Amino acid sequence: TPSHLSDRYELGEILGFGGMSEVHLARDLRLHRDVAVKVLRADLARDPSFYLRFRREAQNAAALNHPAIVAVYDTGEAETPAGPLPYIVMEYVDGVTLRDIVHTEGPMTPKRAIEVIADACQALNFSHQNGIIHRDVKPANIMISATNAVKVMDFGIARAIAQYLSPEQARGDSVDARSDVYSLGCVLYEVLTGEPPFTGDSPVSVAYQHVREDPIPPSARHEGLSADLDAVVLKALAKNPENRYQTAAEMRADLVRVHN
Numbered sequence: 001t002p003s004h005l006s007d008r009y010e011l012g013e014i015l016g017f018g019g020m021s022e023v024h025l026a027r028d029l030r031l032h033r034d035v036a037v038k039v040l041r042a043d044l045a046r047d048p049s050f051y052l053r054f055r056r057e058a059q060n061a062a063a064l065n066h067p068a069i070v071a072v073y074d075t076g077e078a079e080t081p082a083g084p085l086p087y088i089v090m091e092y093v094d095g096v097t098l099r100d101i102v103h104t105e106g107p108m109t110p111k112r113a114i115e116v117i118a119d120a121c122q123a124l125n126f127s128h129q130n131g132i133i134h135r136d137v138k139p140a141n142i143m144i145s146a147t148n149a150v151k152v153m154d155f156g157i158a159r160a161i162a163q164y165l166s167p168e169q170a171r172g173d174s175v176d177a178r179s180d181v182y183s184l185g186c187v188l189y190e191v192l193t194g195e196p197p198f199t200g201d202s203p204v205s206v207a208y209q210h211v212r213e214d215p216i217p218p219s220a221r222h223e224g225l226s227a228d229l230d231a232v233v234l235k236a237l238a239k240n241p242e243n244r245y246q247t248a249a250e251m252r253a254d255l256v257r258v259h260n
């Protein structure tokens, strides 16, 4: 991976990485601001299957303009000794994922958890109103700013109409907005208790539990939780889509009521 992309974005420290890409802190040399730059692996860049999915991620996230969703500024293909190197320029979020927060600090106070998920609901609901289902809602894809703002990211498998998968999504079924609602329920359960609703020694077991087993009410796993919060989480985690919040807006309206 090179020094600068397109003679414009000076690459700095790695912020995150996975199996198909990496994210750098970078400096926009024209605009004089720091940005987050996602770069496709390069050996994968020669693969149309991966090259297209990466471009689709950029296009999906660029279709959304919301203060709680990571904004896309630019996209390109840098010239390297390897060949073309696809990249996406995004707003830099100075913060941490919920995955990091729960791992270092443990469960959040109910009040903070309610605010954080209410804000995530609002982002997802916006996505849905714009015909996009995220499908990868999980703590590693939600960050909290240095200003306490929530930012939903990673539209890598979003579609334009184990521990966090909805039962429909497990079966690669028709997944809709109520699948994101379920995944939000899982994320909420985890920031309230420190653990997701189901764990197991394998992915199929975790999947079997999502499909067949009722979650343990959150108050039974962790002290200081109301029966009303149990009810909200347990309704988001309902097995049948007809029994969950029908939209993320509805989930938020109920969380706000627990708060107020």
Ligand SMILES: Nc1ncnc2c1ncn2[C@@H]1O[C@H](COP(=O)(O)OP(=O)(O)CP(=O)(O)O)[C@@H](O)[C@H]1O
Residues within 6 Å of the ligand: 015, 016, 017, 018, 019, 020, 021, 022, 023, 036, 038, 070, 090, 091, 092, 093, 094, 095, 097, 140, 141, 153, 154, 156
């Ligand atoms: N705009 C941004 N600002 C700050 N950090 C960011 C960021 N975008 C991503 N990150 C950091 O990098 C991590 C990975 O981001 P992201 O979820 O977009 O990658 P990814 O899941 O697509 C990797 P892969 O698909 O290769 O496994 C995030 O959890 C976050 O820590």
Ligand SMILES: [Mg+2]
Residues within 6 Å of the ligand: 140, 141, 154
């Ligand atoms: Mg991710």
Ligand SMILES: [Mg+2]
Residues within 6 Å of the ligand: 018, 020, 021, 154, 156
């Ligand atoms: Mg990805």
